[PDB]
């Protein structure tokens, strides 16, 4: 018999994201990027200083997903064999979240041989000038020192990247991250869950 034409599903209920073979993606070595902070305690010395004139820090990171063997992989950058960060960084005072993100993406990676960001996946707040960050603002905290916002960066069908010589662009399959904070941290390692709502397409 006749079937009825499905009705439009609100993006809030069903978000459909297109994934492509991780083999579509490659890197060309680029100029090595140091980190703006020098030792392990220079970053907070800098955080205090900035928070005073600038105010609360606004960090953003991009999550770029590829796929292999029918499983989502997240693009991490490692350096040593124990350090993994998502591409992103501090925003400029008064800078737009996404626009700024594109600027940082294109900055840390990006084609020198000649960014779709529509989804927010999380927020993390750092209450004090210390390590711990949480997915919420503890009730006793009124002014958190840092706000980290994470976005799903829809990757193009094919892409060339520029990995600063000192970094290694690896593709982490979900089960490597899940329940493995010791390996990747509380943010990164909480992505498998944070991604599960998406209806992924394996092209």
């Amino acid at each position: 018999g006749n079937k009825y034409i499905q009705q439009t599903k609100p993006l809030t209920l069903e978000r459909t994201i297109n994934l492509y073979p991780l083999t579509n993606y490659t890197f060309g070595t680029k100029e090595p990027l140091y980190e703006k902070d020098s030792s392990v305690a220079a970053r907070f010395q800098r955080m205090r200083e900035e928070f005073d004139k600038i105010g609360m820090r606004r960090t953003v990171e991009g999550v770029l997903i590829v796929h292999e063997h029918r499983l989502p992989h997240v693009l991490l950058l490692q350096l040593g064999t124990t350090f993994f960060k998502l591409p992103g960084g501090e925003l400029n005072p008064g800078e737009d979240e996404v626009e700024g993100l594109k600027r940082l993406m294109t900055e840390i990676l990006g084609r020198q041989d000649g960014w779709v960001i529509d989804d927010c996946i999380g927020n993390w707040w750092r209450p004090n000038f210390e390590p711990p960050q949480y997915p919420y603002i503890p009730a006793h905290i009124t002014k958190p020192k840092e706000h980290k916002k994470l976005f799903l960066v829809q990757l193009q069908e094919k892409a060339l990247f520029a990995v600063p010589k000192n970094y290694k662009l690896v593709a982490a399959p979900l089960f490597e991250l899940y329940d493995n904070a010791p390996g990747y941290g509380p943010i990164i390692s909480s992505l498998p869950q944070l991604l599960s709502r998406f209806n992924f397409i394996y092209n």
């Binding site: 209450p127 711990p132 949480y134 503890p138 009730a139 006793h140 905290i141 009124t142 002014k143």
Partner: protein
């Protein structure tokens, strides 16, 4: 030169904790360190409080209790490992 302030709810905020203080005549609040569970960042119920004026510390020791921050009586007590140990045990309710 610094004290402990406890029997605070886990929602008493650095800011409002400051409101109480200023409103004693004490205007030299040197840092405002809350104690908290790393696991979940929840206020342990007591904050380490600093002050350059070593007089106002009495102006708190005596005056702060008998004020109520969210229906609880503050507990200003000089810094000490047996107060440290006093509050840490209290956060276990």
């Amino acid at each position: 030169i610094a004290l402990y302030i406890g029997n605070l709810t886990w929602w008493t905020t650095d800011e409002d904790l400051t409101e109480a203080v200023h409103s004693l005549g004490v205007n030299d609040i040197l840092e405002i360190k809350f104690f908290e569970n790393r696991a979940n960042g929840q206020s342990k119920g007591f904050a380490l409080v600093g002050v350059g004026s070593e007089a106002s510390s009495k102006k708190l020791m005596d005056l702060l209790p008998k004020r109520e921050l969210h229906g609880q009586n503050p507990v200003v007590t000089p810094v000490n490992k047996q107060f440290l140990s006093q509050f840490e045990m209290q956060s276990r309710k």
